[PDB]
């Protein structure tokens, strides 16, 4: 966009948990670059996220093979972030009739999206989510960071949808996650 940077021409929506954080197109960083970052944490300390458009090829099968049941298509860790890429968590889809908040190893995000405790029992986790997808190491924002990049046209904040998380591998999660938004957004996806 000639006028400024793409996103300064659209709304200003919260940072929060739940949000998804959608690289502007012309971020070139190879561990940044076009991703879709879900944010987990937000507060005075920091803001943790993790990207949703990066498939690795580690099996979920190799690293933590009791919990494939409840694993999404495609059953690969997704790689979340640029740190602590040893550190894996699961984000899920709670299914009919459950609420997070009355279950100790889900924790509420927003919506029907909830962080995993992988340390629970598979069997206990199986019927209370619909779907679900692990990734390997995070992003941070140190504070007053994240407002900074906002700032400068480096994110849109848009709502995350469940099938953002449990998004098939044939799927371009940034490129569908920027169709889905007002115009002129879809005129910079790709495919």
Known sequence: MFAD???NAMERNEPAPGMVLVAAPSMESEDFARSVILIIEHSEYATFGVNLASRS?????????????????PQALYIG?????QSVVGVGVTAQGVDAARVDNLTR????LVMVNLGADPEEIKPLVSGM???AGHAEWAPGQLAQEIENGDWFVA??????????????????VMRRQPM???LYSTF
């Open 5 to 7: 940077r793409l996103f």
């Open 184 to 186: 002129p957004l879809p």
């Open 133 to 135: 997808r692990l990734f």
């Open 159 to 176: 709502p995350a949808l469940p099938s953002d998380v449990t998004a098939p591998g044939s799927v371009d999660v940034w490129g569908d």
């Open 109 to 112: 995000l927003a919506n029907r």
């Open 81 to 85: 972030g640029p740190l602590n890429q």
């Open 57 to 73: 090829d580690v099996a979920v099968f190799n690293v933590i093979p009791e919990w494939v049941p409840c694993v999404t298509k």
